[PDB]
Every structure is written in structure tokens, then in C-alpha cells.
């Protein structure tokens, strides 16, 4: 829930301006202290200048080896209660 | 009044205000305007002050800034000042929302 | 006052009053009109430094900096301006929640 | 009037009418010509200055800037024009539909 | 006592106490305002040490430093000043913990 | 004594001793407080080499280095200073082990 | 003796020998002593030769090495020193084993 | 013989016998023992040339390297002793078996 | 006769030769102790063209080569004899071939 | 005839014919032999021009190149003859053949 949906990164050449003139965020620190979420249709284009660049923060698994060491606690519970 | 902030941007007596009204028709935002003036005015230099930067005469040496110097300051000043217009008119990145539709 | 804080944010006595508060009005910030009237007083160099920077009448010799230097001074004094003025409006990253709509 | 105007983007005195209407028929826009015309202007040097940039005579001197620093303004006046004609015949970037035909 | 401190820091006595005060209102940080009495003061070189940097007269000849390098070596402590203020505030890297509600 | 050794870090009789006990009150180590006393040193050369560093009278000629280059060995001695303070704090790379509780 | 040694790694009557036992205190290696001794004279070529460089006074002209090239050699001795005193600490990279408790 | 050999090695004449001594048990090699003992020798020129490099009296003038270009002299000197030296205990690459142990 | 070809390849009459054989016996090809020999000669232009590079007196003016140039020529020509014993000695790549024995 | 090609090659006559022979006899081509040659006939600028190179008696002026400008061209001299030799042993790059053994 922290991390596997990926956090979309821009590299802004002014952070404040930007927020202020698409989601017409003034007071930024205030709408972090208000929890303000933005909100985003799903069908987004972006238009930066040369400078900006905006990517994905995307990483491969979010758990790791959770699903090996899962299925091995699975069978060493079975192995103890001994059950077919 | 316009005319005055061009002639005060753009250094005075150079030009005669027809042809400045000309320079601010030719372009809505003044300082476009005055960045036009002083690339037409870095021309004049060729008159006001010849190609003759230093002479001596009898007990009298005078040495004036070459003609390079003060139009290549000329062209600084009509690239600060078109950069300042550019500044004026520019506008932030920005993200929006495409749509299409569809059934 | 911001013409009072202006005066001496640029130096005194070479602009009259009314276009200090032309440049107040043009922009909110006074550091934005004091970067804007120093570039308005590198214009002025040209007829003090281009027409003569250093002279020399019978047995005395005067030299000034030349156009180049004192213009790219004031160029300087201005760039610095615009610089603290950005600063002073800027502010630092930081990231933000975002939420949309589901049933 | 465009040759009236073409005079002013030049020096005025040092060229007939007959080769500056050449120069306007040419090419459609005016700022081609005066880049065209001034480096026409800039051809003169060879003979000015390329003979003598500078010379004493008995207790007196004189000195010009040497011909490359004058035909290099000239060539930054030429360039700076065909720049200028550039940018107004420049477009910015588009985004544009594709219509195939299919049955 | 903050006035004396800042009359050390920004050398003394081309200024005067009202406005040092209100430089210490505009950043609490006696370097910070430390910093911008440096550049309001390399402004003021242009009229303690004008354009004209060295003159021969008579039997004495005096070269005094150039205005640019005086507002340079003023440009510099500025800099100086401001980087220890960041020096002042500025905290290093370290990592943190992430919380986040479940069922 | 601190107060000794900041003394010798800096030359010896060009200040007053509560300024001394101040830098030292302000940082702890000596090495910042000679560092910073430098700087302040530096400061006092815009009014004994910026107005004039090399001067002739009649016969007699005196130069001196330009402010440029004094500062610039201030400078270096309050830059090597500030080094010096942290090459004395900085330690070297280390590896340590992690433990987290579980059942 | 080390004190005779350190005597003879700088011009020896510069110095009293309280603080150079000081220095020797300060660092086991006597070349470290010597580099931070050597920084700390580079300082007082300040007041043994002055900014005055050169003059000339009747007809004698003496022409002496800038305080800037005297402490540029001063910091050089300094940092050869403590490269010296690094090479005498230095011990060759090299790898070694690893052993953890198993059953 | 050793002293003998360095005296060569270095040039003659400048440094009493114990010094030298005193340099061959600093270190095994005499070159390493040149080498440091050519920094050493570095060391005197401030006093030779750091305060007069060229000097004018009446008609005559003398003048001499600069004390850049002399220590610049002593320290190649010392470097390439050093490198002389290390070059001598250099020894090329090899490859070498490994023989761990097995039932 | 080796001595002879080693006091051609490095000038006559500055070195007695028992210098010149102790070169020789310290390394077998004749380049590299005519190598080692020129840069001990390298030492002695401290003696033989002093710091002293150029003086006038009276009516008559001499120039030298700086100690530096002549002993920047010696490190050269040093270096081309090392160039030259190491073409001497060095011969080129080239593969093998490896067997181990196997049953 | 092979000494009369080196005697041509290197500059005709400074050196005895028999060391010329000497030098016939290291190397087998007569250009490394003269490469060598002019490598010893730069060695001998050192008593021509190190010493003076430009001197002034009265009113004659006499001025000469440096020894580092000759030393180069004879340099240069030599190492083109390397790289004529080079260039005459060498071969150009080709293809061969493999052909090993099986049954």
C-alpha cells in the first residue's frame, strides 16, 4: 500500500508556479498541512518546457521475498499439525 | 504616456516620434518595441562615433570607446530587453487533462 | 515606503520620482523595479564613457573604466536583483498527495 | 514607404536609390534586403579602412578600429537582420491528424 | 549589541543605524542581512570611488583600484556571508521511518 | 589561551580584544573563530588598497598588490582555516551491523 | 633534537620556541608540526614584506616577490610537508579473511 | 660513501654535516634522503629572493629569476629524486598460484 | 672507450671520473647513466649561470637563458636518454603457448 | 657514401669523423645514426646560448633565439629522422594463414 502503485515524478523548473496554474494550489504548504489530494482524471497529457522532465518512480516488486518465506511458513504449519 | 517610457528606455534624441509610434505599432508590448529601437539606434554609432576611436593632437589625447564596444553594448541592451518582453509574456509548464469520446 | 526604500536600492539622484513609481507600478515586488531602473541607468553610460573613457590634456593624464566594465557592473547589479528576487519568491520541492474519484 | 523604411534599417547617404529598389525587388521581406544591403555596406572597408587604420602625422595621431572589427560589426548588423526575418517568418511547433482511407 | 556587530561585519560607517536595523528585520540571521549590506554598499562605490580610476596630474600619479574590482571583491564577501549563513542553518542527510494504517 | 592562540592565528595587534571574545563565544573551536576573523580582516582592505595601490611622486614610484590579490590571500588563510576545522572534526568511513526484533 | 629538526623545516627566528613545542604537542609527526608551522609564517610575511612590492626612491629601484607568491610558496612547503608526513603514515591496500561462528 | 654521495646529489656547500646525517637515518635510500634534503634547500630561497628579485641602482640593473621559478626548480628537483627512487624499488606484475587445502 | 662516449653524450670537463664510472657501474647501458649524469649536471647550473639571468651595467647588457630553461633542456635531454635505453632494451609483444599435464 | 651521408644529414663538421663512425656502428641505418647525432649536437647549446643569448654593448643590440627554440628544432630535426627510419622499416598490415594438425 506504500510503494506498488507507482509515484509520478516531475522535475519542474518552478515547482510553486506550476502547482498554482494547473490545480490552482496558492498556499502549497497550507495544502499539505490540509491533506489536499489532487485530482487526476487517469487521461493526463503534459506539456513541459525543454528543461523539465517528468518520470515514473517505478520499482519492480514492493514486498521483495515476501511470497517465498509466506509459502514456507505455509509449510512448516502444515508440517507441524501434520495434516494431509 | 507610451511614447516618453519608449524615449526613456530607448536613450532620447536619437530618433524623431513618428517612427517610434512606427516601433510600438510594429509590436503590442513596449519593450519588444525598445529592444527594436536600440538595434536600429546601435546602427547610429556609425556616424556619432566614426571608426576614428583615438586621436592626438598638439597636447591634447582623447580616447573614445571603439565602435565595437558600444555596439556590442547596444546589442547587450537589445537582448536584455527582449528578454525582459519574453519574460512579461512567458507562462509555466503545465499538465491537462486529454479526453476523447467514445461508446 | 517603497519609493523611499527604491532611492536607495538603486543609487540616488540620476531618475526623477514619477518613473520610480512607473517602475513600482509595473511590477509587485520593488527588487523587480530596482533591477529594471539599474538596467535603466547602464543605458545611460554610453554618452559619459563612449564618447571618451580616458584622456590626456598637456601634462595630465585621466583614465576611467571603459564602457565595457561599467556597463557589465550595472548588467551585474541588475542580474543580482532579479537573482534575490526569485529567491525571495521561490520556494523548496516537495511532494503531494493525490486522490481520484471511484465507486 | 518600404524604401524609406529600407534607408532608415541602413545608413542613409551611401547608396542610389536604383541598386536599394534591386535589393527590395530581391527578396519580399525588407530585413533580407537590409541584411543583403549591409553587407554590400560591408564590402566598402576594403578601401577605407584596409588602406590605413591608422597614421601619424608630425606630433599628431590618429587611430581607427582595424578592418576586421569593422566589417565583423557590419556582419553582426547583416546577421542580426537575417535573424530578425528568420523569426518573423518562424512558426512554433504543431500536431496534426492523420485521415487514411479504409473499406 | 546587533547594530555594532553588523557595523563590523558590513564595514562601517557609510550607512546609517535606522536602515541597519531594518535589515536585521528582513532576515534574523546577522549574516543574511550582514549579505545584503554588502551588495547595498557595493552599489554605493560608484560615487566613493567613481569611473575614473587613476589621473596623473602635475608631479603625483595615483591608480586607485577599478570600480569593478571593488564591487567584485563586495560581490565576493557577500557571497561569503551568505554561504555562512547557510553554513549556520544548513542540517545534514538522515533517514526517517514510513507509518501507514492497515486492517 | 584561546584567547592567545586567536591572536597568533590572526596578526597580533590590529583588533580589539572583546571582538576576539566574541568570534570565540560565537564558535567554539579556535580554527572557525580564525577563520571567520579573517574574513572580517579581509574587509578592511577597501580603504587602504582599493582607493589606491600604486602611486608616484616626483621621482619616487610605489606599487603594491592590488586588492584583488590581497583579499585573495585572505581568503586562502580563512578557506585553510575553515579546512583545517574540519579535517580536525571529519572521521573516516565505517561499517556497523542491524538488528530488528522478531519472534 | 626535534626542536633543532623543526628549526631547520622553516627559517628559524620567525618563531619562538613556546609555540613551537606547542605545534609539536599539537601532532605526534613532527612534519604535520612543521606543515601547520608553516601556515602560520605564511601569515606573517604580512608585516615582514607589505603589500609594497616594489618602489623606487632616487635612483634606487628594488622590485621584491608579491606577498601572494610568497604565501602561494609558504602553502606549497605547507602541503608538501603534509604529504610527506602522509607518506610516512601510509600503509599498503591490502585484503584480509572473514570468519562468522556457525554450528 | 654516503655522505659523499649526497653531497654530490645535492648541490654543495649548503648544509652542515649533521643535517645530512641526520637525513641518511631519516630514510634507507640516499635518494629519499636528496629529495627531502632538496625541499629543505627550497626552504632558504624566501630569504634570498623573496625579498628582492631585481633591483636597479644608478645606471646599473640586475635582476634574477623570480622565487616561483626558483623553488619551481628545487621541487622538480626533489620530485624527480623521489620518482628516481620509487622507480627503483618498482617492481613489475606477476602472477602467483594458490594452493588452499581439501580432504 | 666508454668514458669517452659518455663525456660526448654529456658535455666535458664539469664532471671528474670517478663520477663517470661510478654512473656507468650503477647501470649497465651507457644511455641510462648518461641519463642519470645529466640530471645530476642539471643541479649545477645553480653554480654556473646563477638565479642572476639577465643584468646591465654601465653601457653593456647581457641576457641568459634562466636556470629554468637550462634546467628544463637537461630534464629533456635526461629524458631522451632514458627514451633511447628503454627503445634499447624493450622488444615487443608476442604470444606462447601453455601444456599442463593431464592423464 | 655512408659517413658522407651522415656528414650530410647532420650539419657538416662540428663533430670528428671517427665518432661519426662510432655512432655508423651502433645502428646499422644512417638515420637513427643521424637522429642520434643531432641529439648530441643539441647538447652543445648550452655553452652557445644558455649563457647569453641576447647582450647589448653601447649602441649594437644583438639578439639570438633562446636555447629552448633551438634546442626544439634540433630536436625536432632528430625526431623526424626517427620517424623517417620507422617509416622506412615499417610494414603495412596483412592476412595469413592457419594450418594445424589432426587425424
Given at each position: 500500500?506504500?510503494?506498488?502503485?507507482?509515484?509520478?515524478?516531475?522535475?519542474?523548473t518552478d515547482?510553486?508556479s506550476?502547482?498554482?496554474?494547473?490545480?490552482?494550489?496558492?498556499?502549497?504548504?497550507?495544502?499539505?498541512?490540509?491533506?489536499?489530494?489532487?485530482?487526476?482524471?487517469?487521461?493526463?497529457?503534459?506539456?513541459?518546457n525543454?528543461?523539465?522532465?517528468?518520470?515514473?518512480?517505478?520499482?519492480?516488486?514492493?514486498?521483495?521475498?515476501?511470497?517465498?518465506?509466506?509459502?514456507?511458513?505455509?509449510?512448516?504449519?502444515?508440517?507441524?499439525?501434520?495434516?494431509? | 504616456?507610451?511614447?516618453?517610457?519608449?524615449?526613456?528606455?530607448?536613450?532620447?534624441?536619437?530618433?524623431?516620434?513618428?517612427?517610434?509610434?512606427?516601433?510600438?505599432?510594429?509590436?503590442?508590448c513596449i519593450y519588444c518595441?525598445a529592444s527594436?529601437?536600440?538595434?536600429?539606434?546601435?546602427?547610429?554609432?556609425?556616424?556619432?562615433?566614426?571608426?576614428?576611436?583615438?586621436?592626438?593632437?598638439?597636447?591634447?589625447?582623447?580616447?573614445?570607446?571603439?565602435?565595437?564596444?558600444?555596439?556590442?553594448?547596444?546589442?547587450?541592451?537589445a537582448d536584455k530587453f527582449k528578454d525582459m518582453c519574453t519574460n512579461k509574456k512567458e507562462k509555466g509548464?503545465?499538465?491537462?487533462?486529454?479526453?476523447?469520446?467514445?461508446?
Amino acid at each position: 500500500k506504500m510503494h506498488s502503485t507507482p509515484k509520478l515524478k516531475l522535475k519542474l523548473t518552478d515547482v510553486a508556479s506550476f502547482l498554482a496554474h494547473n490545480f490552482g494550489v496558492e498556499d502549497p504548504v497550507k495544502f499539505a498541512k490540509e491533506g489536499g489530494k489532487i485530482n487526476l482524471d487517469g487521461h493526463e497529457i503534459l506539456f513541459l518546457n525543454k528543461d523539465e522532465e517528468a518520470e515514473f518512480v517505478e520499482v519492480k516488486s514492493a514486498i521483495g521475498d515476501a511470497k517465498e518465506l509466506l509459502k514456507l511458513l505455509f509449510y512448516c504449519i502444515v508440517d507441524v499439525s501434520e495434516t494431509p | 504616456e507610451k511614447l516618453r517610457l519608449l524615449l526613456n528606455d530607448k536613450d532620447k534624441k536619437s530618433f524623431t516620434d513618428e517612427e517610434l509610434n512606427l516601433f510600438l505599432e510594429e509590436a503590442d508590448c513596449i519593450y519588444c518595441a525598445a529592444s527594436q529601437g536600440w538595434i536600429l539606434k546601435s546602427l547610429q554609432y556609425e556616424n556619432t562615433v566614426g571608426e576614428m576611436y583615438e586621436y592626438k593632437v598638439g597636447q591634447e589625447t582623447y580616447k573614445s570607446s571603439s565602435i565595437k564596444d558600444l555596439v556590442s553594448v547596444a546589442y547587450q541592451n537589445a537582448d536584455k530587453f527582449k528578454d525582459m518582453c519574453t519574460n512579461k509574456k512567458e507562462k509555466g509548464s503545465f499538465m491537462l487533462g486529454i479526453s476523447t469520446e467514445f461508446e
